[PDB]
Amino acid sequence: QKRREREQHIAECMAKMPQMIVNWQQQQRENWEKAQADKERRARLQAEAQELLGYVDPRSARFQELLQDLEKKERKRL
Amino acid sequence: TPDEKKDEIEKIKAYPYMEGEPEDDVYLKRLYPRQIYEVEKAVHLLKKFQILDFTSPKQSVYLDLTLDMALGKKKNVEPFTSVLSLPYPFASEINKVAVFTENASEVKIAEENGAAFAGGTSLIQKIWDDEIVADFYVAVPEIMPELNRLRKKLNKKYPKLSRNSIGRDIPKMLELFKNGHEIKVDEERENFLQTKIATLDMSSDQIAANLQAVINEVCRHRPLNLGPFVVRAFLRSSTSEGLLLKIDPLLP
Amino acid sequence: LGQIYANNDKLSKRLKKVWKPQLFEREFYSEILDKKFTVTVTMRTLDLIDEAYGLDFYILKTPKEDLCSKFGMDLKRGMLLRLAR
Amino acid sequence: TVIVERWWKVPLAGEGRKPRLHRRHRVYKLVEDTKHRPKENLELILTQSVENVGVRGDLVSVKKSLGRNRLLPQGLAVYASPENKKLFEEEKLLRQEGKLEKIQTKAGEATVKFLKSCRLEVGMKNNVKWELNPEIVARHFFKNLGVVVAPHTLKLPEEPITRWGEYWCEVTVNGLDTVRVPMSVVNFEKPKTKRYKYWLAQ
Amino acid sequence: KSKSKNILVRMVSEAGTGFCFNTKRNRLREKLTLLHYDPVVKQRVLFVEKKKIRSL
RNA sequence: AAUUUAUUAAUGCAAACAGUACCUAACAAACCCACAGGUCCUAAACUACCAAACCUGCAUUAAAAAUUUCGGUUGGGGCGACCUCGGAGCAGAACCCAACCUCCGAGCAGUACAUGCUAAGACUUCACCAGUCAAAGCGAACUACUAUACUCAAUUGAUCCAAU
RNA sequence: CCGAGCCUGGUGAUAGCUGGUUGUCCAAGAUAGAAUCUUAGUUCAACUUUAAAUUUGCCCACAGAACCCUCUAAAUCCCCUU
RNA sequence: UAGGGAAUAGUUUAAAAAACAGCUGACUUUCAAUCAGCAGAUGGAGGUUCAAUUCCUCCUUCCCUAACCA
Ligand SMILES: [K+]
Ligand SMILES: [K+]
Ligand SMILES: [K+]
Ligand SMILES: [Mg+2]
Ligand SMILES: [Mg+2]
Ligand SMILES: [Mg+2]
Ligand SMILES: [Mg+2]
Ligand SMILES: [Mg+2]
Ligand SMILES: [Mg+2]
Ligand SMILES: [Mg+2]
Ligand SMILES: [Mg+2]
Ligand SMILES: [Mg+2]
Ligand SMILES: [Mg+2]
Ligand SMILES: [Mg+2]
Ligand SMILES: [Mg+2]
């Protein structure tokens, strides 16, 4: 009985695996495209702010907060 | 699980009880545990006492229920008021409800469903500037900002989402209130619930049905099988001592 | 009279330790001897007397190696001599 | 009693030989001290009557302190040995059927002693015309004195009582003892009013 | 002996075989999900971090 | 200094040993009732205190003691400094080579997630322990990212035991 | 001979430390290191001795063993023949 | 490390409020105080629900309690 249960558990878990990989691969691609978005936007905003004031916790915090609010304001509309 | 609250729950369970009269004809009550049980016999007995202790044929049966209103998890549930009409509503007439709705079609739905007091700013200002008494209040979400003025006045009796008294559909509490009878809660939160069931003249079967309805009504707050919700039940008339009902069969 | 390891750890110090029984002075009545005796006893002795249904049964039933008392053996001889005579 | 066990294994000695004990076998760990065990009750058969239990021949489970320091030394109880159980059991049969008279139960003796020294305040309302009958009077034992009286047992003065006054109720406890209690018919006062009026005031 | 910048974690196979391997990840980064060869099923399967063994 | 409280004193709990007490904040708004008070709009539920010592067991805190130790290198010892690992010179060309000799470093980080499995033949810090490199093969990868024992110099810790 | 008496016993205490260790004759026989509360000692290597097995040992011809860097050193390693 | 608990405005509390600080001012020689204003928050992520400080889940930080032996 123990052997049959372990084999059944593996079989069931391994029939789902092909779809799981598809989801995982897409998440990696999605994370690659999110990092690029972050790499771009954070740097520009933070860089400009630092150059103006002081040539940096306050400014970074503000930009790191307002951007979140903009996403939330869209989520509030949803 | 605070020691006092949980320990009392352990203690109240401990209180012994017995079936049937002891063999002895005359026995001191102290020498034997509580005995009288069956809900049918209990109602019949309460009628017997009414005759012996000359009193009104019709009296309020103020059933007090030691309902485990706590210990769902080690975190305890809280006191609410699940309002439902009994199968045969007793002859008491109660039609007191305040509805807050301003410049909305709900004003019509409020009065259409039998609201006693319906109004907006004018009604809110009356509550703050002058004394007025209603049993329960309801408000639509749009008026909650304005109603916040009466939060302090009502001392947490103002409508709250927790009691399902904030919502576009007012009839949650409004409609059912007149026929419905409120399951109020203890002030000391010792879990005993004083809830009238029936007038004494109501037939035993009708009172028995009225009892069962409350059993489901009270479990509504925590109808989980995780924690037993009922411990003891005392069916008392106004001018009589409480009798320990055998509520275990009727619990589920 | 024995030894113990401190904190029940064999790697710690070994200490001398004596466990003494709790002693009680109680009065008992012997039916065969029709006399009352004040004797120092333990709670075990009281339990054994209860299981024997009295002092006389306890004294007569209990073997010498279990009584562990010269006085107890003297009571046995007294009781047995009265029964024999 | 202290119960100990050895830390170190003792080598087997074999058949007909004594174990070889090294000085390491003197090291002991405390398994249990039996004085801390939950106390068990002592089963005794009563001889005379006691307030807690008093039916001669009743098998009672008492605290070992009570049985050993009071009941057994004084002769009020005996050990529940097979021999004693047989003797008391035989007596029970004779009481049920034979000449030996039936006796009150444990509760019956307690009630009789209470009923001997008690007065019943049968509060009756002024407004409604009332006639005192066994059933009504029986109710007042429960409310006032706390005694649960069967209606049939009560024997009233047999003179209809409709006026405040004093009378006598003859209570029969289990059919053997008849007690006559003083009866004080008084104007009924609700519990809250009576306690506030006098108990609080004085 | 230095600031703890990485941590050791146990990656557990999602095949239900129970085969596990230990990998090092940054403390601040999110839990690792990796495609790793599982000998029991003899093919690459998705693994998910379950526990943190120790701090590296 | 480490270890310890058996011992002694104090404290708590248990053990042992008596019983004592059982709990009161209305109010009629209407109506009844000569009063005194009642009907209605609750008149429920609920036991609480609790034995002084001596002795014994288990704990905690003190006192007073007990047992045991106080590393090495070193142009004498102490003081200072040093103690493991790697690169360079001394040691010019196979290997090896010292000084409290001369210099500079290490106690990681980063990328993989087949850093999977298995197996000829070898190297080796002068012993041992440990350490190092690997064909073929299985399974992968692959359609030319100097690709299948990652980059990196050192980047490190035996046995018992503990956790799982 | 009190930094803690004396006697007896455990006791032939233990001592990596010093001292001592008994007839004759012959033979082979000197010394890379590693670890160690270890450097006044040990264990493993190395050397040394005895017995046994079967096959090369020593001496060495060419050819051959790195750039970076200054003394472009005396030499070494490998090695048939003999 | 183990579980338990916790996370609210710059700060500290409450069931989305008050208090202080910042205060922009007014008034005090100066400064405090005082008065009136004004900014200000539900650790992070994901999900349920029309709506989540108020349901759940994982992670970070901190506390508690117990470890931290070899
Ligand atoms: K010198
Ligand atoms: K010498
Ligand atoms: K030495
Ligand atoms: Mg040391
Ligand atoms: Mg030295
Ligand atoms: Mg020196
Ligand atoms: Mg020094
Ligand atoms: Mg070697
Ligand atoms: Mg290959
Ligand atoms: Mg001398
Ligand atoms: Mg010697
Ligand atoms: Mg020679
Ligand atoms: Mg060492
Ligand atoms: Mg040496
Ligand atoms: Mg040669």
Q: How long is the CA E40 to C1' G56 vector, in angstroms? A: 55
Instruction: Answer for the pair D140, D120: CB distance below 8 angstroms, yes or no.
Output: yes
Give domain limits for chain E.
5-56
- CB B183 within 8 Å of CB B195: yes
Q: Which residues pair with D46 in a beta bridge?
A: D77
CATH topology of domain E5-56: Rubrerythrin, domain 2 (2.20.28)
B26 to chain D: which residues are within 8 Å by CB? 108, 111, 115, 147-150, 153, 171-174
**Do the beta carbons of residue B158 and residue B144 sit within 8 Å?**
no
Place of tokens 């916040």: B148
CA distance A52 to chain E (A): 30
Distance in angstroms: CA B81, C1' F129: 77
Is D62 in contact with D41 (CB distance < 8 Å)?
yes
Q: Write down the residue that tokens 């998910």 correspond to.
A: E48
Q: At residue D169, what are phi and psi to the nearest 5 degrees?
A: -110, 125
Would strands D2-6 and C35-41 be described as parallel, antiparallel, or unpaired?
A: unpaired
Alpha carbon distances (Å) from D112 to B54, D15, D142: 29, 69, 15
Instruction: Compare CB distances from C2 to D28, D35, D81 and report the shortest one's residue.
Output: D28
Give me the amino acid identity at A58: P
Tell me how far apart the alpha carbons of residues B231 and A63 are, in angstroms, rounded to a whole number.
58
Q: Which member of C14, C29, C43 has the closest CB to residue D35?
A: C43
Give the side-chain half-sphere CA count within 13 A for D164: 10
Query: Using an 8 Å Cβ cutoff, are E9 and E32 in contact?
Result: yes
Pick the residue of D148, D154, D174, D181 with the most B CBs within 10 A to test the interface with B by mutation. D148
Conformational region of residue C63, where left means phi above 0, alpha means psi within -120 to 50, and beta covers everything else: beta
Structure determination method: cryo-EM
3-state per-residue secondary structure call for chain B: CCHHHHHHHHHHHHCCECCCCCCCCCEEHHHCCECCCCHHHHHHHHHHHHHHCCCCCCCEEEEEEECCCCCCCCCCCCCCCCCECCCCCCCCCCCCCEEECCCCCHHHHHHHCCCCEEECHHHHHHHHHCCCCCCCEEECHHHHHHHCCHHHHHCCCCCCHHHCCECCCHHHCHHHHHHCECCCCCCCCCCEEEEEEEECCCCHHHHHHHHHHHHHHHHCCCCCCCCCCCCEEEECCCCCCCEECCCCCCCC
Rg (CA), chain C: 18
Of the candidates D147, D123, D150, the residue with the CA atom closest to the CA atom of residue D134: D150
CA distance linking residue D25 with residue E53, whole number of Å: 43
Q: Which residues of D touch B (CB under 8 A)?
A: 105-108, 110-111, 114-115, 125, 128, 130, 135-136, 139, 142-143, 146-150, 152-153, 171-175
**For residue C70, what are the contacts with CB-CB under 8 A and spacing of at least 6?**
none
Q: Which residues in range 209-248 of chain B are in contact with strand F, contact meaning CB within 7 A of any of its atoms?
A: 234, 236, 238-242
The nucleotide minimizing the C1' distance to residue D192's CA is F26
Helix, coil or strand: residue D101: coil
Read off the DSSP letter of residue D27. Answer: B
How many angstroms is the resolution? 2.6
Contacts with D130 from chain B: Cβ below 8 Å: 54
Q: Which nucleotides of strand F lie within 7 A of protein CB? A: 3-7, 14-19, 22, 24-27, 32-33, 35-48, 55-58, 107-114, 116-117, 139-140, 156
